[PDB]
A paper describes a structure:
We also present structures of [name], in isolation (2.4 Å resolution), in complex with avenolide (2.0 Å resolution), and bound to a synthetic DNA oligonucleotide (3.09 Å resolution) derived from its natural binding site. The overall structure is reminiscent of that of other TetR-family transcriptional repressors, and consists of an obligate homodimer. Each monomer is entirely helical and consists of a DNA-binding domain (DBD; composed of α helices 1–4), and a ligand-binding domain (LBD; consisting of α helices 5–13).
Co-crystallization efforts for [name] bound to avenolide yielded crystals that diffracted to 2.0 Å resolution, and crystallographic phases were determined using molecular replacement (Thorn and Sheldrick, 2013). Clear density for the entire hormone can be visualized bound to the LBD of both monomers in the homodimer. Notably, the structure of [name] undergoes conformational shifting upon ligand binding, and a structure-based superposition against the ligand-free structure illustrates that binding of the hormone results in an ~10o shift in the DBD of each monomer. This shift results in an increase in the distance between the two DBD in the dimer upon binding of the ligand, which would preclude DNA binding by the ligand-bound homodimer. Additional local changes between the two structures included the movement of Gln165, which swings into the binding pocket to make hydrogen-bonding interactions with the lactone ring, as well with Gln64. Last, Thr108, which is harbored on helix α6, also moves to accommodate interactions with the hormone. The indole side chain of Trp127 likewise shifts to increase the volume of the binding cavity. Other interactions include hydrogen bonds between Thr131 and the C10 hydroxy, and an interaction between Thr162 and the lactone ring of avenolide. The superimposition suggests that the new contacts formed by these residues are likely to couple hormone binding to the conformational shift between the two monomers of [name]. Specifically, movement of Gln64 and Thr108 into the ligand-binding cavity of [name] upon engagement of the hormone results in the displacement of helix α6 away from the pocket.
Author numbering:
A (entry chain E): 0 to 217
B (entry chain A): 7 to 217
Write the structure that this text describes.
Amino acid sequence: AVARQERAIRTRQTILVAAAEVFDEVGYEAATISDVLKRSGVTKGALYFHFTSKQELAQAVLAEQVASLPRVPEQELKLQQSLDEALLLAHLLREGTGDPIVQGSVRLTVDQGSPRDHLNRRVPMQAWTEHTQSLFEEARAKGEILPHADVEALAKLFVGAFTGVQVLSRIMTGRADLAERVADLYRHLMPSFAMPGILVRLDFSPERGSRVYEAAMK
Amino acid sequence: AIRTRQTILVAAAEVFDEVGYEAATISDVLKRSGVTKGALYFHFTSKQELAQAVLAEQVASLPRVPEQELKLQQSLDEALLLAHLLREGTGDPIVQGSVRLTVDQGSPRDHLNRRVPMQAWTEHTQSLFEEARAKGEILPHADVEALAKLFVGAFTGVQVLSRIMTGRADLAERVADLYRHLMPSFAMPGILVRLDFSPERGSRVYEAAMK
Ligand SMILES: CC[C@@](C)(O)C(=O)CCCC[C@H]1C=CC(=O)O1
Ligand SMILES: CC[C@@](C)(O)C(=O)CCCC[C@H]1C=CC(=O)O1
């Protein structure tokens, strides 16, 4: 029983990682259960214990998007935390290795599909919006945000802007410039709402990005 | 014949919007455009060539906003116009489908070059920011290329989020938020206050652009 549940945990992750990969490579519609079976090396029995259909598997990779980012060390500035997360996500989307679910999950999110596929792409977008607003809320309690800033509007701006920065970067450089583009984004958004005292202390450097990455990989 | 090429282009874009590139067919396009097989094949050899042309026509499809002395306003006018056109469709029936073709990842096997509209938007936005900079609307040494990339990128994402969350119902608000929040990082003194974000202005811009 104890061993059965440990196997169940590991098997689900194995499926999710393999499924995200095939969804990344070929998209939702062209992907098959067979592709995922070939990639994971799990049995057909194992896959159906965890997921009911391709659709429900796709939904799960969508739903695990936010939970996929390694949690950054809890720190002094909440807006530095947001920057650290965004730059880590930029690294994870270019490299893939540190989190093999995100690339595929983002592709499923951003591909339009149709109402016919019954995928709920709002799921990860809502979760990122909540994630981001929550961090702004904590930043505001810690005196990091200007008075009368709309933290919901701001959260929606950050999620949307990040998404499109990602898209443009994917198209133009295959995400090679993504960390630089994300840094640029944060440098031009933060001045509208971050307390000036916080703004001078924020660290946008690839060296800090590198250290956060090295830390998150344990 | 040029108008027949456009009728086909509009129909192809709408078909690409509805069902995507892979699922779409010449037969869908012919049904939608109501042109003969001969008319289509004179202008395009394949679905692939059709897709490349609606991708290519993206920037040019955007109706020209009236020239403005405040160049930042001109950009805002364009941004809010494009928001409006992406939400409704009727004033630029090409753009919805062209955007889906740009944003959908597809595969390197499809021979579609998504770089073409993105490069064109970047050069367009860069030119405006050069004019803005020279007229003293933005910081004299602002990296106008990086800003263009930032604006094209951020707009695309705001668009994508709005489509997913509201079907683009909130797009104009979200684009306004984008411009309002990016501007203080690089605008010259007294410029941000001069900008007009109102939907009444947006409406006047829309009308003039169609005329
Ligand atoms: C702004 C930075 C951060 C960490 O707080 C996010 O909310 C990340 C948003 C990621 C959204 C994801 C969905 C589509 C896409 O391209 O990326
Ligand atoms: C920033 C405002 C503007 C007018 O100057 C643009 O460049 C618009 C960029 C349009 C990009 C297009 C591709 C995907 C998408 O969602 O929209």
